[PDB]
Amino acid sequence: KVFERCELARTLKRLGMDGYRGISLANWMCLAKWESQYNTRATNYNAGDRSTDYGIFQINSRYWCNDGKTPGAVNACHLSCSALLQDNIADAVACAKRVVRDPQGIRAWVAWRNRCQNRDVRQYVQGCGV
């Protein structure tokens, strides 16, 4: 599913993402936007290390979900990477919360650092009623 901006903002808000571990809804929107252009079936294979990024948040198979084909990988979200390719984002949100429960927080995603950190992200939630 390809989410429309404001539709996604309210979806994330209803799932408990606004301020989760101090991360505003605008930051999560900026992350999904730059990671997948709001696309739940987005995927990116990393030929360099045999891992794959899955879904709207592009969560990596090496540590967060199991796809059965990444060497010595773990599954901290206790999910099949397939769960991260559903139109319903509940499972992807539960995993994203798990990622940020670690030391780096939202910084776990390099793209957040490159295009969201120290930027004006207000535009992502403006007019969404969140």
Supply the DSSP string of 12-55, one letter for each residue.
HHHTT-TTBTTB-HHHHHHHHHHHHSSBTT-EEEETTTTEEEET
- Which domains, and CATH codes, for the chain? 1-130 (1.10.530.10)
Question: Do residues 43 and 82 lie in contact, with contact meaning Cβ atoms separated by under 8 Å?
Answer: no
Does residue 7 carry a catalytic annotation? no
Residues 6+ apart with CB under 8 A from 91: 79, 83, 84
74: helix, strand or coil: coil
Selecting among 18, 53, 102, 120, the annotated active-site residue is: 53
Rounded to whole angstroms, what are the CA distances from 47 to 40, 66, 68, 81, 110? Answer: 21, 17, 16, 17, 18
Indicate which technique resolved this structure.
Answer: X-ray
User: Quick check: is 49 catalytic?
Assistant: no
How many whole angstroms separate alpha carbon 128 and alpha carbon 130?
6
CA–CA separation, 24 vs 86, rounded Å?
Answer: 24
- Side chain identity at residue 44, one-letter code: N
Which residue has tokens 């969201």? 116
Query: What is d(CA 1, CA 44) in angstroms, rounded to the nearest whole number?
Result: 16
> Cα–Cα distance between 63 and 76 in angstroms, integer?
6
